[PDB]
Amino acid sequence: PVSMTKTSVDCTMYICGDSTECSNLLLQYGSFCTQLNRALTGIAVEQD
Amino acid sequence: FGAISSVLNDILSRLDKVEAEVQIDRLITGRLQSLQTYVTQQLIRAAE
Amino acid sequence: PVSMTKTSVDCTMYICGDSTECSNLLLQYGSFCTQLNRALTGIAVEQDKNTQEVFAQVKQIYKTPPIKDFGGFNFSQILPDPSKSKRSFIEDLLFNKVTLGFIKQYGDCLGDIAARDLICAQKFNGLTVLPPLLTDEMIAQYTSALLAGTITSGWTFGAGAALQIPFAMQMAYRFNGIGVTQNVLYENQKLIANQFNSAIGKIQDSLSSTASALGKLQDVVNQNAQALNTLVKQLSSNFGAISSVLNDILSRLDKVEAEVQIDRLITGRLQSLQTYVTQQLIRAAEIRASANLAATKMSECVLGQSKRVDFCGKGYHLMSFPQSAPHGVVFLHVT
Amino acid sequence: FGAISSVLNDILSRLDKVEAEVQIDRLITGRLQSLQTYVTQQLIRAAEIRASANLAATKMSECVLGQSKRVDFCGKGYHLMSFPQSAPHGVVFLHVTYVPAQEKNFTTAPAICHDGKAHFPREGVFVSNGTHWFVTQRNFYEPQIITTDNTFVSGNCDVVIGIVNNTVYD
Amino acid sequence: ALDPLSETKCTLKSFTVEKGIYQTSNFRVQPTESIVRFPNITNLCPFGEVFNATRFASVYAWNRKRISNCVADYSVLYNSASFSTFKCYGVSPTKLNDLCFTNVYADSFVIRGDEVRQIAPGQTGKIADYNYKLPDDFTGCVIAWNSNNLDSKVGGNYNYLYRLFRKSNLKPFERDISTEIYQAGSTPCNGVEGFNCYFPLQSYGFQPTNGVGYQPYRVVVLSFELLHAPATVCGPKKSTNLVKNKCVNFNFNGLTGTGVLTESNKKFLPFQQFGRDIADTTDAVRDPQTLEILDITPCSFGGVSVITPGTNTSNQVAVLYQDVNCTTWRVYSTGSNVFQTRAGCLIGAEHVNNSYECDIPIGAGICASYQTSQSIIAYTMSLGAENSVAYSNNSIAIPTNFTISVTTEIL
Ligand SMILES: CCCCC/C=C\C/C=C\CCCCCCCC(=O)O
Ligand SMILES: CCCCC/C=C\C/C=C\CCCCCCCC(=O)O
Ligand SMILES: *[C@@H]1O[C@H](CO)[C@@H](O)[C@H](O)[C@H]1NC(C)=O
Ligand SMILES: *[C@@H]1O[C@H](CO)[C@@H](O)[C@H](O)[C@H]1NC(C)=O
């Protein structure tokens, strides 16, 4: 094996959906998702 | 995750501004932890 | 890369601060902080073995002779100059390309400097960095010993006692190893020496220009700082509570209404620390792999002559020279 | 984990179903987190163990089933052989190596000059015991006499730096 | 908490400790004094004009008064005032005596008893839909008490009104004094009342024999904010002096905490009172008397390690302070063998001039051991027995013998 599948995640769309009440509440964290996407972007850049 | 439902539209259809926060917070916490676990296991898989 | 940064965390200072109520409430977990610190201590202890394995291959600090007496080659730029951190020219060039545990007194961070320096804001929250056990001067002395053994004894100094041999009579051997006879070397010694010198000069001129070329060693520092600054910023999250400040919770609420809100913050910040430690454990493994590769190159490329293809450089290998950099090592491969 | 007790039978002996679910959910969450941490750490250790196992599998092939030429891979010194032994959760290798013992100093020069033609040793190096000139191998001093079979000729004696003058026989 | 050795014993959870170096808690400094700084206020609040008035308003045209520059010692109500209902939402009742309040408003009106439960967030009734509504993020206190001897007459009191028949529900703190004929059906109305057009106001009866639930109640809603702005209103607490450059517990206008107070060059604006660093923590405040700016700095800062040879050979130890340059005061003890390495101030070990191998690693090339009366010594580590090589120009060394080694490798 030489590579795996690259992925990306929208945390607002997975957690809150189309609701606008959950998004305002999730803003109170706001910095744990960017971490996730940073890690996943590293993985994706490494697989190439 | 310890809430009365797993559908935000079934929660926001019965409970008001304040009685609904205590449940959406549980759902947020749980789904954030799910994403964290996913990313951690993918980080461990990419090293192999 | 050969190493990363060591860290330590007082969890009572990060989570609770100076409040006694929170520190009494935090005894009800009591078993995870010791675990976190166990992990971090394992990392920190591994980070010095990663260096002892690379640079401390030999335990005889060989010295360089006054008059060179080499066949025409010039190691003035890799060998030291006692004038100066008795490093070398190229090593100095390297250290002035990577930016960044030293003493920082409470009298310095006292005032507005705190909350404005990014290193005092950590220490005020229980996060500390630890100095490495080997200083840069020791590492450079090790490197100089390795270089001076390579240059005066060939490879014999890695299989027992060190036997001396002229440099050209050594390059003849290194030639016969790839498939070229001796006469080729004894009959083009001057030209080969000139080409070698010009190659090293081009190296020096490209490293004296204004291109970094050392990103693999800078990204380490950048990641290690970003992690701690992200951790410091993560303290402004409410985690489901009415506020992120314990004193505001304790100035308006009694002993009963306040636990409901302080336990949320405790849990959140404990999870933050858990995540930090997990990611550090995962990066330490990459660093360990790279350190083992470097320790294999220092023995197959510096202490001998490799026959593997594209391991000790691109082409038919002749030799290699080590140099120390911040958190890593650099090899100059002569092919 | 923020509850009134760590024993479910004290929670269930004093509180009803509604008041007790609130307290049991917290314990569930915390213990689940504990197990997740356990499993993550075991996954991170299995990787180290796998790397060590792969290195041992490489050493068995390259040091036992053959003779390695890499430096410091199988032992300290010039490798000869190896022998495996089994130990609890691991393996032990007994590496046999050759190590030089007693050094002696000589003077040397390449490209011997008999008559206008340079001679090179073709295997080994030239040495002198003070007055005579022999050719010998590199890792064990066994001197021989210099003839035209153990050397070869190349060019004339006008370039090499170190060339000396002596007699080669046939 | 007797010494770092006991701390590491309690950490490892054992009465024996193996030799090495361990990390301990950071250097903590404890306070010596307590400081309190409230504004300079002299007069009392109008508890009389509010709670003991002669005519209260109506719930549809409720009244809203302002409170400023006063001292809230509610103990004066304990004499003749008796409150049937008292409920606070964003603050605990046992802390109303230690705070200062920002924008205090008092809303007053009269209702019937069985409607007092409607004065709260999310209640869905006649008084919360058409007459008076409260936010969902209400911070304040609700107070209510019976008035069946003042607001009730012997033949019926019809001077208190409530709004029936509104087209849509009200919003928080929004008033409505309109009197326009309400149309029930779809047929139009032209200011005349019949069979589908009703006057949207009606009056209680408030007789003196009416039963609980039909008896009058007076209500007072107090609204305010906390710990964000000047707060000209304050409670009954007597202040002290100001102690700079010392670790003190403080209470600035209701904000507690502990630290060191120092002068600042920052310049605020006339509508600012706090500093709120990146992490939402205060790092500056304006004194409410001298109007000067002060910084705030924690007292705990450090990093401390313990060197131990083993509790089965000795019980002497050494201590390493990583952020102290003893060449001296931020220490537990001073001892008599200070060294001041580059990794900190080492206290408890004798420095030597020799060079051995590392037994216990410390940092920056320093190591420690248990040498010979036995003590702890600290020194600079060795690197491997300096040697030299004899490269002249034309000499070579050749071996004449060999050895067969046998080494081990565990995996
Ligand atoms: C004029 C209003 C001033 C408002 C000042 C701000 C907050 C004061 C809070 C509560 C004051 C009323 C407390 C009721 C007295 C206790 C009940 C009793 O009497 O037994
Ligand atoms: C006759 C059975 C109808 C049941 C319909 C189902 C749900 C209706 C729910 C609640 C109705 C109660 C009305 C209370 C009136 C508000 C209080 C008041 O101000 O008086
Ligand atoms: C309000 O009026 C009463 C008289 O009934 C009086 O006793 C009381 O002192 C007044 N309230 C306060 C706080 O003084
Ligand atoms: C070689 O070494 C062995 C011991 O290792 C010794 O007994 C023997 O005499 C040596 N041989 C010579 C030629 O000295």
Numbering used by the authors:
A (entry chain C): 725 to 772
B (entry chain C): 967 to 1014
C (entry chain B): 725 to 808, 810 to 825, 829 to 1063
D (entry chain A): 967 to 1136
E (entry chain A): 292 to 618, 632 to 676, 686 to 724
Report text from the authors:
The attachment of SARS-CoV-2 to a host cell is initiated by the spike (S) protein trimer, which adorns the outer surface of the virus, binding to its cognate receptor angiotensin-converting enzyme 2 (ACE2) with higher affinity than the SARS-CoV S protein. Structures of trimeric S protein show its receptor-binding domain in either an up or a down conformation. Toelzer et al. produced SARS-CoV-2 S in insect cells and determined the structure by cryo–electron microscopy. In their dataset, the closed form was predominant and was stabilized by binding linoleic acid, an essential fatty acid.
Model building of the closed form revealed additional density in the RBDs in our structure. In our structure, a hydrophobic pocket mostly shaped by phenylalanines forms a bent tube into which the LA fits well. The anchor for the headgroup carboxyl is provided by an arginine (Arg408) and a glutamine (Gln409) from the adjacent RBD in the trimer, giving rise to a composite LA binding site. In previous apo S cryo-EM structures, about 60 to 75% of the S trimers were in the open conformation, in contrast to our observation of ~70% in the closed conformation. In the apo SARS-CoV-2 S trimer, a gap between adjacent RBDs places the hydrophilic anchor residues ~10 Å from the position of the LA headgroup. Upon LA binding, the adjacent RBD in the trimer moves toward its neighbor, and the anchor residues Arg408 and Gln409 lock down on the headgroup of LA. Overall, this results in a compaction of trimer architecture in the region formed by the three RBDs, producing a locked S structure. The RBM, central to ACE2 binding, appears to be conformationally preorganized in our structure, indicating a generally more rigid RBD trimer when LA is bound. Although direct cross-talk between the LA binding pocket and the RBM is not apparent from our structure, the conformational changes in the RBD trimer could affect ACE2 docking and infectivity, as indicated by our SPR assays that show reduced levels of S binding in the presence of LA. Glycosylation sites are located away from the LA binding pocket and are largely native in our structure.
